[PDB]
Each structure stands twice: as structure tokens, then as C-alpha cells.
Protein: Glycylpeptide N-tetradecanoyltransferase
Organism: Leishmania major
Amino acid sequence: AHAFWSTQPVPQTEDETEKIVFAGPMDEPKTVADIPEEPYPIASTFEWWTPNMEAADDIHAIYELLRDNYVEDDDSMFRFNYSEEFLQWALCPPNYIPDWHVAVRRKADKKLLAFIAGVPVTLRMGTPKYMKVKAQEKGEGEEAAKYDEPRHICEINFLCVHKQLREKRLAPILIKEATRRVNRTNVWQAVYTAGVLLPTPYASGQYFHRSLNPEKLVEIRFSGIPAQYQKFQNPMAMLKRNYQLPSAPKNSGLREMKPSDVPQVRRILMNYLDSFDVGPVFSDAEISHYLLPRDGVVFTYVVENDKKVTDFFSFYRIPSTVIGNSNYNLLNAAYVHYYAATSIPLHQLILDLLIVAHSRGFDVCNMVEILDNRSFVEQLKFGAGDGHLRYYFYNWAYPKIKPSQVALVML
Ligand SMILES: CCCCCCCCCCCCCC(=O)SCCNC(=O)CCNC(=O)[C@H](O)C(C)(C)COP(=O)(O)OP(=O)(O)OC[C@H]1O[C@@H](n2cnc3c(N)ncnc32)[C@H](O)[C@@H]1OP(=O)(O)O
Ligand SMILES: COC(=O)c1ccc(N2CCCCCC2)c(NS(=O)(=O)c2ccc(OC)cc2)c1
């Protein structure tokens, strides 16, 4: 039973979801003038706060709340440790709305107790192909197509309640106040993901990881040496052999992405993302923000042939705190971000991702089975983790789709 989510304009059951035939709004059409001008009421010892993402001390505050209190895995082996530089990057894309970043602080000492962030995203989120076909079969083409144009909506991330304040219903208050700020901006949909089941996902996928430094990985979690390896003479040398990578990229013509590559990257990325039912649209400014290399944050490489960019990949860095270890308190993880291949097989492109990551000191490469990530799992020796990432809309009816029909990477 769901005392908050039952009240919200989301599909409430899988049964309800299975029934959905067209993309479209759930809720009453509303107008900005209907929405309360003032912040949602909160207890007199709490105050709403809009952090200034240009203030190092505000970013620091958010950083520490998330370092101590954000996402842990089911077994509490790790907790994400997103960096200050990463947060400034993720929270401040072009045309971001400062008012969309919502915090609660304790009035007396200004201790940050909770946070949620929204950023703009331009998302294709019209009726998926398999449902459009079914629509043509019913005569229902126009309805199925009504909402095809990319929409300017809200992408929610970084919801976090301090461990001291858990299970006191503070999260629904944060979501209501975020929903108010976004609505006042004349935006009525959001997209968000979670590693937990909520009412009700439009897509779900497994996590997949690829060891880059198996020595350091056993030393934490991987249950020491992976069980299947114990059964031989020298497990660690065998493990290292399994995961070993070349020192330098295999693709000649691979180089770091530069500002003048922005138009070409935008084109091959947009062409590639059209094959997916749900996916982002990026302007030149957004391509530049999300994909231009930034030290310790995002890394992006292009294959340039004959002075033309024909392929590219990107990955971003999220360290995790290793929850109970000594020798090793940090896990240095690289996450697969956007890419596009047109001159080589995807696995050959992504092998260079792994080589670059390994060369730069990353311990593991992580991803969700979105995009065409499944097409290189086996050859590049990725293994499924215990995670599942569920994708959700707020105020949007959407048929269930496979994760391989999802092109939105969640930072
Ligand atoms: C148009 C614009 C719309 C904009 C907004 C779109 C909606 C955005 C929605 C948010 C998208 C976030 C995307 C991400 O960032 S996903 C990452 C979420 N963050 C973490 O997991 C960090 C560690 N955990 C925590 O900080 C807390 O446990 C959280 C904050 C998750 C819950 O706090 P707490 O444990 O102290 O509980 P409560 O008593 O305050 O609240 C209980 C209610 O909260 C519902 N709950 C539990 N976990 C989540 C979850 N991940 N998404 C949405 N709802 C969740 C739960 O079912 C229950 O409602 P109900 O079952 O009684 O009905
Ligand atoms: C908060 O999660 C982490 O920080 C993390 C870091 C690394 C992970 N894996 C697990 C396998 C061995 C260690 C490296 C790769 C994993 N395992 S995971 O299976 O990728 C995973 C990722 C996110 C998630 O969100 C609730 C649950 C599971 C998690």
C-alpha cells in the first residue's frame, strides 16, 4: 500500500500499465495560474532552501549529504560518492532552472537534511513503435502519434533524505515541492529512475559490470576471488589474465573529443538515438555540456577518419565508498554514457572505452542494459550485477518497453 504514490498521477499497477496503448498525460490539464504561488507548508523547525550551484559551499553541502546518505546497494557494500565537480556538471546543464533544485535545511543550524534536483531534458516520449503498429491495426494512428514531438520536461535525480530523518515522510514533501516548482514553470511531466520498485515502471534493466582492476576488486567485493575461480591452481593470476586489456586504444584515429567536434557528434548521436522509443534530444550547447571532456568527471573520445568523426564514446566517473573495508575505502567506477558507432562494430568501439578507462585508473566499468549495451556484454566480459534500474514517468501514460528501447542515460 502507498499512502503517497496512490495520490499521484502515475500508473498504479502493472495491470494498469499493460493496458496502456498510447503515450499521453495522466492528470487533469492544469494551468500555471492554478498552482500555489508559495512553497508547500513544512514544519517550523525546517526551511526550504534553493542552493546556489555557483556557490562552492552550497555544492559542498549537497556533496556531503549525498556522500553520507545517498544510494547504497541492497547489501550495503557500497554507497555512491558523486564528486563536487560532478554535481556541478550534472545539476547545471544549459538553461537549467535554479529553482528546480530543492533542499530542506534545519532552520537552527542550516544542516542540510534532504535534497531533490530537477534539470531540463528534451525527451522523445511518444507511443513506442510496437504500440504504433497495433494502433495502425485499430485505425487509431492519429491518437497514437499525438505526442511524438520531443517534449521539454523535467529530469529528476539525487533525491536524498538524511539517515537520521528516514521514514518520517520527508520524501513525499520534497517531491510535492519539486512538482510545484516545475509546474509553475509550465512543465507537467518528469522522467526519473530508481533501483527500487515503485508504481509503476515503463522499463527495467539489469546492471552490468566489467572488471578493470581485479586485484583491487577481490580485496573488496566480488566475494573475494569469484567462486568459479577458486577451483584452480592460481586464481588471481587467472583472474588478471581474464580481464587484461591493451595499454593503448586499438582504433587508430581515436582521440579525445574537442570543441570543434560538437556539430558532428551531435549529428551521429541524434541519428543513432532515433532508433529508440524513449530518448533525449540535445542541442549543440547540450552536447558540449554533457560530452566535452572534464577532468575527473566525463571522458569522451571520437574516431576521426579522413578528418571526419564517424564514431564516438563517452563515460563518466562515479566513485563509491566501500562501506566496511580498511585497505580500500574507494571504488573508482566508470559508467558507460552516450556513444555512436558507424564505421566499426560496437564491441570494437567499446573495447577502446574499457582500454581508456583502465589506462586512467578506473577499477570497473558499469552500465545498465539500455541502448544497445547488450550487444557487447559477452565479448567484452561484462557480468550482470544485483542491481535493476527502473525507468518512470510522472504524469505520462506509457506502454511497457524493453530496456533496449531506452536511450536516456541516467547520471
Ligand atoms: C512535473 C514534475 C514532477 C517532478 C517530480 C517527479 C516525481 C519524482 C519522484 C522521486 C524520484 C527520485 C529519483 C531518485 O533520485 S532514486 C534515488 C533515491 N535515493 C536514495 O535511495 C538515497 C538513499 N535513500 C533515501 O535517501 C531515502 O530512503 C529516500 C529519499 C529514497 C526515501 O525517503 P525515506 O526512506 O525517508 O521515506 P519517507 O518516509 O520520507 O517516504 C516514504 C515514501 O517515499 C517513497 N519512496 C521511497 N524511495 C523512493 C524513491 N527512490 N523515489 C520515489 N519515491 C520513493 C516510498 O514508496 C514512500 O511512499 P508510499 O509508498 O508511502 O506511497
Ligand atoms: C550504490 O551502488 C554502488 O555504489 C555500486 C558500485 C559498484 C557495483 N558493482 C558490483 C559488483 C562488484 C563491484 C563493482 C561493480 C554495484 N553493483 S550494481 O550491481 O552495479 C548496482 C548499481 C546500482 C544500484 O542501485 C541501487 C544497485 C546495484 C553498485
